[PDB]
PDB file of all heavy atoms in Angstrom:
ATOM      1  N   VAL Z 146      -1.838 -14.478   8.067  1.00 25.57           N
ATOM      2  CA  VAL Z 146      -1.776 -13.301   7.208  1.00 25.57           C
ATOM      3  C   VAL Z 146      -3.142 -12.878   6.699  1.00 25.57           C
ATOM      4  O   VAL Z 146      -3.943 -13.681   6.221  1.00 25.57           O
ATOM      5  CB  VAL Z 146      -0.933 -13.541   5.945  1.00 25.57           C
ATOM      6  CG1 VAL Z 146      -1.041 -12.271   5.059  1.00 25.57           C
ATOM      7  CG2 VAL Z 146       0.489 -13.885   6.308  1.00 25.57           C
ATOM      8  N   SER Z 147      -3.405 -11.582   6.766  1.00 25.08           N
ATOM      9  CA  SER Z 147      -4.630 -10.976   6.260  1.00 25.08           C
ATOM     10  C   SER Z 147      -4.355 -10.342   4.887  1.00 25.08           C
ATOM     11  O   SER Z 147      -5.001 -10.676   3.902  1.00 25.08           O
ATOM     12  CB  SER Z 147      -5.203  -9.882   7.168  1.00 25.08           C
ATOM     13  OG  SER Z 147      -4.216  -9.061   7.779  1.00 25.08           O
ATOM     14  N   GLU Z 150       1.235  -5.650   1.309  1.00 29.06           N
ATOM     15  CA  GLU Z 150       1.405  -4.501   0.433  1.00 29.06           C
ATOM     16  C   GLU Z 150       2.814  -4.555  -0.173  1.00 29.06           C
ATOM     17  O   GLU Z 150       3.746  -4.619   0.614  1.00 29.06           O
ATOM     18  CB  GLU Z 150       1.250  -3.169   1.173  1.00 29.06           C
ATOM     19  CG  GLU Z 150      -0.076  -3.094   1.901  1.00 29.06           C
ATOM     20  CD  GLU Z 150      -0.005  -2.149   3.094  1.00 29.06           C
ATOM     21  OE1 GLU Z 150       1.099  -1.751   3.525  1.00 29.06           O
ATOM     22  OE2 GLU Z 150      -1.106  -1.855   3.618  1.00 29.06           O
ATOM     23  N   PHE Z 202      -6.145   0.549 -10.992  1.00 45.68           N
ATOM     24  CA  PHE Z 202      -6.199   1.915 -11.497  1.00 45.68           C
ATOM     25  C   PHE Z 202      -4.798   2.256 -12.024  1.00 45.68           C
ATOM     26  O   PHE Z 202      -3.796   2.038 -11.318  1.00 45.68           O
ATOM     27  CB  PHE Z 202      -6.627   2.923 -10.479  1.00 45.68           C
ATOM     28  CG  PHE Z 202      -8.099   2.985 -10.074  1.00 45.68           C
ATOM     29  CD1 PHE Z 202      -8.428   3.098  -8.719  1.00 45.68           C
ATOM     30  CD2 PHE Z 202      -9.102   2.958 -11.008  1.00 45.68           C
ATOM     31  CE1 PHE Z 202      -9.771   3.180  -8.376  1.00 45.68           C
ATOM     32  CE2 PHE Z 202     -10.441   3.061 -10.687  1.00 45.68           C
ATOM     33  CZ  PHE Z 202     -10.770   3.146  -9.333  1.00 45.68           C
ATOM     34  N   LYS Z 204      -2.315   4.854 -15.071  1.00 49.93           N
ATOM     35  CA  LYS Z 204      -2.260   5.785 -16.201  1.00 49.93           C
ATOM     36  C   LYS Z 204      -0.863   6.349 -16.397  1.00 49.93           C
ATOM     37  O   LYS Z 204      -0.008   6.275 -15.510  1.00 49.93           O
ATOM     38  CB  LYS Z 204      -3.225   6.953 -15.947  1.00 49.93           C
ATOM     39  CG  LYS Z 204      -2.837   7.792 -14.749  1.00 49.93           C
ATOM     40  CD  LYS Z 204      -3.846   8.861 -14.381  1.00 49.93           C
ATOM     41  CE  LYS Z 204      -5.144   8.279 -13.837  1.00 49.93           C
ATOM     42  NZ  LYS Z 204      -5.112   7.830 -12.423  1.00 49.93           N
ATOM     43  N   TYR Z 207       3.493  12.162 -15.560  1.00 52.99           N
ATOM     44  CA  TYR Z 207       4.771  12.859 -15.470  1.00 52.99           C
ATOM     45  C   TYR Z 207       5.712  12.265 -16.513  1.00 52.99           C
ATOM     46  O   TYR Z 207       6.887  12.029 -16.276  1.00 52.99           O
ATOM     47  CB  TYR Z 207       5.389  12.777 -14.063  1.00 52.99           C
ATOM     48  CG  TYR Z 207       4.330  13.215 -13.053  1.00 52.99           C
ATOM     49  CD1 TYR Z 207       4.059  12.465 -11.912  1.00 52.99           C
ATOM     50  CD2 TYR Z 207       3.605  14.368 -13.293  1.00 52.99           C
ATOM     51  CE1 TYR Z 207       3.090  12.906 -11.045  1.00 52.99           C
ATOM     52  CE2 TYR Z 207       2.628  14.809 -12.420  1.00 52.99           C
ATOM     53  CZ  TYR Z 207       2.378  14.058 -11.289  1.00 52.99           C
ATOM     54  OH  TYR Z 207       1.414  14.468 -10.403  1.00 52.99           O
ATOM     55  N   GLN Z 217      -1.823   1.214  -9.308  1.00 52.53           N
ATOM     56  CA  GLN Z 217      -2.130   0.644  -7.998  1.00 52.53           C
ATOM     57  C   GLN Z 217      -3.091  -0.520  -8.277  1.00 52.53           C
ATOM     58  O   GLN Z 217      -4.147  -0.328  -8.856  1.00 52.53           O
ATOM     59  CB  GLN Z 217      -2.707   1.678  -7.078  1.00 52.53           C
ATOM     60  CG  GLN Z 217      -1.628   2.657  -6.624  1.00 52.53           C
ATOM     61  CD  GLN Z 217      -2.065   3.633  -5.562  1.00 52.53           C
ATOM     62  OE1 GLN Z 217      -3.136   4.232  -5.702  1.00 52.53           O
ATOM     63  NE2 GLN Z 217      -1.300   3.822  -4.494  1.00 52.53           N
ATOM     64  N   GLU Z 221      -7.126 -10.338  -4.903  1.00 58.74           N
ATOM     65  CA  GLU Z 221      -7.736 -11.260  -3.941  1.00 58.74           C
ATOM     66  C   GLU Z 221      -7.228 -12.658  -4.297  1.00 58.74           C
ATOM     67  O   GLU Z 221      -7.272 -12.996  -5.493  1.00 58.74           O
ATOM     68  CB  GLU Z 221      -9.243 -11.294  -3.958  1.00 58.74           C
ATOM     69  CG  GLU Z 221      -9.906 -10.056  -3.402  1.00 58.74           C
ATOM     70  CD  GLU Z 221     -11.344 -10.353  -2.986  1.00 58.74           C
ATOM     71  OE1 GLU Z 221     -12.112 -10.911  -3.788  1.00 58.74           O
ATOM     72  OE2 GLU Z 221     -11.697 -10.004  -1.844  1.00 58.74           O
ATOM     73  N   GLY Z 225      -8.869 -16.167  -0.143  1.00 55.09           N
ATOM     74  CA  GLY Z 225      -9.489 -15.046   0.521  1.00 55.09           C
ATOM     75  C   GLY Z 225      -8.566 -13.943   0.992  1.00 55.09           C
ATOM     76  O   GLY Z 225      -9.033 -12.858   1.308  1.00 55.09           O
ATOM     77  N   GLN Z 227      -5.611 -10.996   0.839  1.00 53.69           N
ATOM     78  CA  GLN Z 227      -5.625  -9.873  -0.086  1.00 53.69           C
ATOM     79  C   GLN Z 227      -4.252  -9.233  -0.243  1.00 53.69           C
ATOM     80  O   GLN Z 227      -3.432  -9.364   0.666  1.00 53.69           O
ATOM     81  CB  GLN Z 227      -6.562  -8.786   0.415  1.00 53.69           C
ATOM     82  CG  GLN Z 227      -8.009  -9.203   0.432  1.00 53.69           C
ATOM     83  CD  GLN Z 227      -8.985  -8.153   0.897  1.00 53.69           C
ATOM     84  OE1 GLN Z 227      -9.941  -8.472   1.620  1.00 53.69           O
ATOM     85  NE2 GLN Z 227      -8.793  -6.908   0.466  1.00 53.69           N
ATOM     86  N   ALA Z 228      -4.030  -8.561  -1.363  1.00 53.65           N
ATOM     87  CA  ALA Z 228      -2.781  -7.810  -1.516  1.00 53.65           C
ATOM     88  C   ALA Z 228      -3.006  -6.549  -2.366  1.00 53.65           C
ATOM     89  O   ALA Z 228      -3.933  -6.482  -3.164  1.00 53.65           O
ATOM     90  CB  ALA Z 228      -1.678  -8.651  -2.103  1.00 53.65           C
ATOM     91  N   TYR Z 229      -2.121  -5.591  -2.126  1.00 57.79           N
ATOM     92  CA  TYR Z 229      -1.914  -4.359  -2.852  1.00 57.79           C
ATOM     93  C   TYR Z 229      -0.559  -4.411  -3.558  1.00 57.79           C
ATOM     94  O   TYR Z 229       0.408  -4.823  -2.908  1.00 57.79           O
ATOM     95  CB  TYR Z 229      -1.954  -3.168  -1.887  1.00 57.79           C
ATOM     96  CG  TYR Z 229      -1.305  -1.936  -2.464  1.00 57.79           C
ATOM     97  CD1 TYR Z 229      -1.922  -1.231  -3.499  1.00 57.79           C
ATOM     98  CD2 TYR Z 229      -0.079  -1.490  -1.986  1.00 57.79           C
ATOM     99  CE1 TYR Z 229      -1.305  -0.106  -4.014  1.00 57.79           C
ATOM    100  CE2 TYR Z 229       0.540  -0.362  -2.511  1.00 57.79           C
ATOM    101  CZ  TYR Z 229      -0.099   0.313  -3.526  1.00 57.79           C
ATOM    102  OH  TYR Z 229       0.464   1.442  -4.090  1.00 57.79           O
ATOM    103  N   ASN Z 233       5.403   2.059 -10.089  1.00 58.62           N
ATOM    104  CA  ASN Z 233       5.453   3.487 -10.355  1.00 58.62           C
ATOM    105  C   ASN Z 233       6.754   3.805 -11.075  1.00 58.62           C
ATOM    106  O   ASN Z 233       7.788   3.315 -10.603  1.00 58.62           O
ATOM    107  CB  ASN Z 233       5.301   4.137  -8.970  1.00 58.62           C
ATOM    108  CG  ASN Z 233       5.049   5.625  -9.049  1.00 58.62           C
ATOM    109  OD1 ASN Z 233       5.747   6.239  -9.848  1.00 58.62           O
ATOM    110  ND2 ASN Z 233       4.108   6.136  -8.246  1.00 58.62           N
ATOM    111  N   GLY Z 238      13.565   5.207  -6.374  1.00 56.09           N
ATOM    112  CA  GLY Z 238      13.436   3.773  -6.241  1.00 56.09           C
ATOM    113  C   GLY Z 238      12.976   3.300  -4.867  1.00 56.09           C
ATOM    114  O   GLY Z 238      13.479   3.715  -3.818  1.00 56.09           O
ATOM    115  N   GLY Z 246       0.073  -9.764   9.901  1.00 54.49           N
ATOM    116  CA  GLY Z 246      -0.232 -11.036  10.535  1.00 54.49           C
ATOM    117  C   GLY Z 246      -0.983 -10.812  11.830  1.00 54.49           C
ATOM    118  O   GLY Z 246      -0.954  -9.674  12.336  1.00 54.49           O
ATOM    119  N   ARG Z 275       7.240  -6.420  13.680  1.00 73.09           N
ATOM    120  CA  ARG Z 275       6.495  -5.629  14.659  1.00 73.09           C
ATOM    121  C   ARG Z 275       5.592  -6.581  15.435  1.00 73.09           C
ATOM    122  O   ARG Z 275       4.724  -7.205  14.811  1.00 73.09           O
ATOM    123  CB  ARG Z 275       5.689  -4.517  13.999  1.00 73.09           C
ATOM    124  CG  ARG Z 275       4.798  -3.795  15.035  1.00 73.09           C
ATOM    125  CD  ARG Z 275       4.115  -2.588  14.375  1.00 73.09           C
ATOM    126  NE  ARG Z 275       5.179  -1.614  14.100  1.00 73.09           N
ATOM    127  CZ  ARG Z 275       4.928  -0.418  13.571  1.00 73.09           C
ATOM    128  NH1 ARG Z 275       3.668  -0.106  13.286  1.00 73.09           N
ATOM    129  NH2 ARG Z 275       5.938   0.413  13.352  1.00 73.09           N
TER     130      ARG Z 275
ATOM    131  N   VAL J 146       3.376  14.781  -6.944  1.00 74.95           N
ATOM    132  CA  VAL J 146       2.889  13.519  -6.395  1.00 74.95           C
ATOM    133  C   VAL J 146       2.150  12.683  -7.423  1.00 74.95           C
ATOM    134  O   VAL J 146       1.287  13.159  -8.160  1.00 74.95           O
ATOM    135  CB  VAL J 146       1.885  13.728  -5.250  1.00 74.95           C
ATOM    136  CG1 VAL J 146       1.349  12.332  -4.833  1.00 74.95           C
ATOM    137  CG2 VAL J 146       2.524  14.476  -4.108  1.00 74.95           C
ATOM    138  N   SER J 147       2.465  11.397  -7.453  1.00 73.36           N
ATOM    139  CA  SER J 147       1.812  10.422  -8.318  1.00 73.36           C
ATOM    140  C   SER J 147       0.769   9.638  -7.505  1.00 73.36           C
ATOM    141  O   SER J 147      -0.405   9.614  -7.850  1.00 73.36           O
ATOM    142  CB  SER J 147       2.773   9.405  -8.942  1.00 73.36           C
ATOM    143  OG  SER J 147       3.815   8.982  -8.072  1.00 73.36           O
ATOM    144  N   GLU J 150       0.141   5.920  -0.305  1.00 72.42           N
ATOM    145  CA  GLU J 150      -0.340   4.710   0.344  1.00 72.42           C
ATOM    146  C   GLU J 150      -0.533   5.003   1.839  1.00 72.42           C
ATOM    147  O   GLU J 150       0.436   5.440   2.440  1.00 72.42           O
ATOM    148  CB  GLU J 150       0.638   3.540   0.206  1.00 72.42           C
ATOM    149  CG  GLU J 150       0.972   3.270  -1.247  1.00 72.42           C
ATOM    150  CD  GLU J 150       2.337   2.607  -1.392  1.00 72.42           C
ATOM    151  OE1 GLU J 150       3.137   2.584  -0.432  1.00 72.42           O
ATOM    152  OE2 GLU J 150       2.597   2.148  -2.530  1.00 72.42           O
ATOM    153  N   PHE J 202     -11.750  -4.064  -2.076  1.00 96.37           N
ATOM    154  CA  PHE J 202     -11.893  -5.469  -1.715  1.00 96.37           C
ATOM    155  C   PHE J 202     -11.915  -5.540  -0.181  1.00 96.37           C
ATOM    156  O   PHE J 202     -11.041  -4.953   0.484  1.00 96.37           O
ATOM    157  CB  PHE J 202     -10.811  -6.349  -2.256  1.00 96.37           C
ATOM    158  CG  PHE J 202     -10.820  -6.702  -3.742  1.00 96.37           C
ATOM    159  CD1 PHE J 202      -9.622  -6.644  -4.463  1.00 96.37           C
ATOM    160  CD2 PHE J 202     -11.968  -7.098  -4.379  1.00 96.37           C
ATOM    161  CE1 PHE J 202      -9.650  -6.995  -5.806  1.00 96.37           C
ATOM    162  CE2 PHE J 202     -12.009  -7.472  -5.708  1.00 96.37           C
ATOM    163  CZ  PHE J 202     -10.819  -7.387  -6.433  1.00 96.37           C
ATOM    164  N   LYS J 204     -13.421  -7.945   3.580  1.00 96.39           N
ATOM    165  CA  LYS J 204     -14.223  -9.024   4.165  1.00 96.39           C
ATOM    166  C   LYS J 204     -13.884  -9.246   5.628  1.00 96.39           C
ATOM    167  O   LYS J 204     -12.845  -8.800   6.124  1.00 96.39           O
ATOM    168  CB  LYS J 204     -13.957 -10.329   3.398  1.00 96.39           C
ATOM    169  CG  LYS J 204     -12.529 -10.811   3.528  1.00 96.39           C
ATOM    170  CD  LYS J 204     -12.195 -12.012   2.667  1.00 96.39           C
ATOM    171  CE  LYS J 204     -12.188 -11.684   1.179  1.00 96.39           C
ATOM    172  NZ  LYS J 204     -10.978 -10.991   0.672  1.00 96.39           N
ATOM    173  N   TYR J 207     -10.466 -13.532  10.467  1.00 97.78           N
ATOM    174  CA  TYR J 207      -9.860 -13.858  11.753  1.00 97.78           C
ATOM    175  C   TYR J 207     -10.722 -13.249  12.855  1.00 97.78           C
ATOM    176  O   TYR J 207     -10.241 -12.688  13.827  1.00 97.78           O
ATOM    177  CB  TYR J 207      -8.406 -13.370  11.860  1.00 97.78           C
ATOM    178  CG  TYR J 207      -7.646 -13.867  10.632  1.00 97.78           C
ATOM    179  CD1 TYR J 207      -6.847 -13.013   9.876  1.00 97.78           C
ATOM    180  CD2 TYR J 207      -7.779 -15.188  10.245  1.00 97.78           C
ATOM    181  CE1 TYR J 207      -6.195 -13.516   8.778  1.00 97.78           C
ATOM    182  CE2 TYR J 207      -7.122 -15.692   9.137  1.00 97.78           C
ATOM    183  CZ  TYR J 207      -6.328 -14.834   8.404  1.00 97.78           C
ATOM    184  OH  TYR J 207      -5.665 -15.303   7.299  1.00 97.78           O
ATOM    185  N   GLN J 217      -8.842  -3.309   1.520  1.00 98.42           N
ATOM    186  CA  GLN J 217      -7.851  -2.605   0.710  1.00 98.42           C
ATOM    187  C   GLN J 217      -8.663  -1.789  -0.307  1.00 98.42           C
ATOM    188  O   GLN J 217      -9.440  -2.341  -1.067  1.00 98.42           O
ATOM    189  CB  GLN J 217      -6.894  -3.564   0.066  1.00 98.42           C
ATOM    190  CG  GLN J 217      -5.934  -4.142   1.102  1.00 98.42           C
ATOM    191  CD  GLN J 217      -4.822  -4.986   0.532  1.00 98.42           C
ATOM    192  OE1 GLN J 217      -5.094  -5.849  -0.309  1.00 98.42           O
ATOM    193  NE2 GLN J 217      -3.575  -4.780   0.935  1.00 98.42           N
ATOM    194  N   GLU J 221      -9.080   7.154  -6.932  1.00102.14           N
ATOM    195  CA  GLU J 221      -8.584   8.054  -7.976  1.00102.14           C
ATOM    196  C   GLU J 221      -9.125   9.446  -7.645  1.00102.14           C
ATOM    197  O   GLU J 221     -10.333   9.537  -7.363  1.00102.14           O
ATOM    198  CB  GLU J 221      -9.018   7.706  -9.378  1.00102.14           C
ATOM    199  CG  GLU J 221      -8.373   6.465  -9.946  1.00102.14           C
ATOM    200  CD  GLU J 221      -8.452   6.464 -11.470  1.00102.14           C
ATOM    201  OE1 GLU J 221      -9.545   6.657 -12.028  1.00102.14           O
ATOM    202  OE2 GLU J 221      -7.400   6.252 -12.102  1.00102.14           O
ATOM    203  N   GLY J 225      -6.590  13.130 -11.146  1.00100.00           N
ATOM    204  CA  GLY J 225      -5.861  12.031 -11.731  1.00100.00           C
ATOM    205  C   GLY J 225      -4.896  11.299 -10.824  1.00100.00           C
ATOM    206  O   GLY J 225      -4.459  10.207 -11.160  1.00100.00           O
ATOM    207  N   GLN J 227      -3.497   9.207  -7.491  1.00 97.72           N
ATOM    208  CA  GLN J 227      -4.079   7.966  -7.001  1.00 97.72           C
ATOM    209  C   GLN J 227      -3.691   7.672  -5.558  1.00 97.72           C
ATOM    210  O   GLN J 227      -2.656   8.168  -5.112  1.00 97.72           O
ATOM    211  CB  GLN J 227      -3.597   6.791  -7.834  1.00 97.72           C
ATOM    212  CG  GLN J 227      -4.080   6.828  -9.261  1.00 97.72           C
ATOM    213  CD  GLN J 227      -3.652   5.670 -10.125  1.00 97.72           C
ATOM    214  OE1 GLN J 227      -3.320   5.867 -11.304  1.00 97.72           O
ATOM    215  NE2 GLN J 227      -3.688   4.455  -9.581  1.00 97.72           N
ATOM    216  N   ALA J 228      -4.504   6.884  -4.869  1.00 97.07           N
ATOM    217  CA  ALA J 228      -4.118   6.455  -3.522  1.00 97.07           C
ATOM    218  C   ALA J 228      -4.655   5.044  -3.228  1.00 97.07           C
ATOM    219  O   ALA J 228      -5.631   4.603  -3.820  1.00 97.07           O
ATOM    220  CB  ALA J 228      -4.573   7.423  -2.462  1.00 97.07           C
ATOM    221  N   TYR J 229      -3.951   4.398  -2.308  1.00 93.86           N
ATOM    222  CA  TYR J 229      -4.261   3.146  -1.657  1.00 93.86           C
ATOM    223  C   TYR J 229      -4.561   3.405  -0.181  1.00 93.86           C
ATOM    224  O   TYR J 229      -3.796   4.158   0.433  1.00 93.86           O
ATOM    225  CB  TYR J 229      -3.078   2.179  -1.788  1.00 93.86           C
ATOM    226  CG  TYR J 229      -3.129   1.065  -0.774  1.00 93.86           C
ATOM    227  CD1 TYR J 229      -4.082   0.051  -0.886  1.00 93.86           C
ATOM    228  CD2 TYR J 229      -2.239   1.034   0.293  1.00 93.86           C
ATOM    229  CE1 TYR J 229      -4.112  -0.958   0.059  1.00 93.86           C
ATOM    230  CE2 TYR J 229      -2.276   0.021   1.242  1.00 93.86           C
ATOM    231  CZ  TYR J 229      -3.225  -0.966   1.099  1.00 93.86           C
ATOM    232  OH  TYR J 229      -3.313  -2.002   2.009  1.00 93.86           O
ATOM    233  N   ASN J 233      -7.388  -2.449   8.639  1.00 90.11           N
ATOM    234  CA  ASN J 233      -7.264  -3.843   9.032  1.00 90.11           C
ATOM    235  C   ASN J 233      -7.500  -3.952  10.530  1.00 90.11           C
ATOM    236  O   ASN J 233      -6.902  -3.141  11.250  1.00 90.11           O
ATOM    237  CB  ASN J 233      -5.857  -4.246   8.564  1.00 90.11           C
ATOM    238  CG  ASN J 233      -5.627  -5.738   8.627  1.00 90.11           C
ATOM    239  OD1 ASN J 233      -6.025  -6.294   9.644  1.00 90.11           O
ATOM    240  ND2 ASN J 233      -5.009  -6.313   7.588  1.00 90.11           N
ATOM    241  N   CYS J 236      -4.459  -7.200  12.938  1.00 86.57           N
ATOM    242  CA  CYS J 236      -3.016  -7.185  13.124  1.00 86.57           C
ATOM    243  C   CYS J 236      -2.526  -6.113  14.080  1.00 86.57           C
ATOM    244  O   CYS J 236      -3.223  -5.183  14.457  1.00 86.57           O
ATOM    245  CB  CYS J 236      -2.336  -7.020  11.740  1.00 86.57           C
ATOM    246  SG  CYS J 236      -2.781  -5.439  10.952  1.00 86.57           S
ATOM    247  N   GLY J 238      -0.927  -2.725  15.603  1.00 90.54           N
ATOM    248  CA  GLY J 238      -1.197  -1.369  15.180  1.00 90.54           C
ATOM    249  C   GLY J 238      -0.164  -0.783  14.223  1.00 90.54           C
ATOM    250  O   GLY J 238       1.052  -0.860  14.430  1.00 90.54           O
ATOM    251  N   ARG J 275      13.078  10.411   1.157  1.00 96.82           N
ATOM    252  CA  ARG J 275      13.982   9.652   0.295  1.00 96.82           C
ATOM    253  C   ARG J 275      14.220  10.474  -0.967  1.00 96.82           C
ATOM    254  O   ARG J 275      13.247  10.736  -1.687  1.00 96.82           O
ATOM    255  CB  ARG J 275      13.428   8.273  -0.039  1.00 96.82           C
ATOM    256  CG  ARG J 275      14.328   7.552  -1.067  1.00 96.82           C
ATOM    257  CD  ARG J 275      13.831   6.113  -1.270  1.00 96.82           C
ATOM    258  NE  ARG J 275      14.108   5.403  -0.015  1.00 96.82           N
ATOM    259  CZ  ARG J 275      13.847   4.106   0.140  1.00 96.82           C
ATOM    260  NH1 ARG J 275      13.317   3.443  -0.883  1.00 96.82           N
ATOM    261  NH2 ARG J 275      14.127   3.529   1.301  1.00 96.82           N
TER     262      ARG J 275
END
Side-chain angles (χ1 to χ4, degrees):
Chain Z
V146 175
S147 38
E150 305 154 346
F202 286 136
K204 64 186 69 79
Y207 309 132
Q217 287 187 313
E221 289 201 309
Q227 294 181 220
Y229 161 71
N233 192 316
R275 174 174 291 183
Chain J
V146 175
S147 38
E150 305 154 346
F202 286 136
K204 64 186 69 79
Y207 309 132
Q217 287 187 313
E221 289 201 309
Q227 294 181 220
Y229 161 71
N233 192 316
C236 62
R275 174 174 291 183

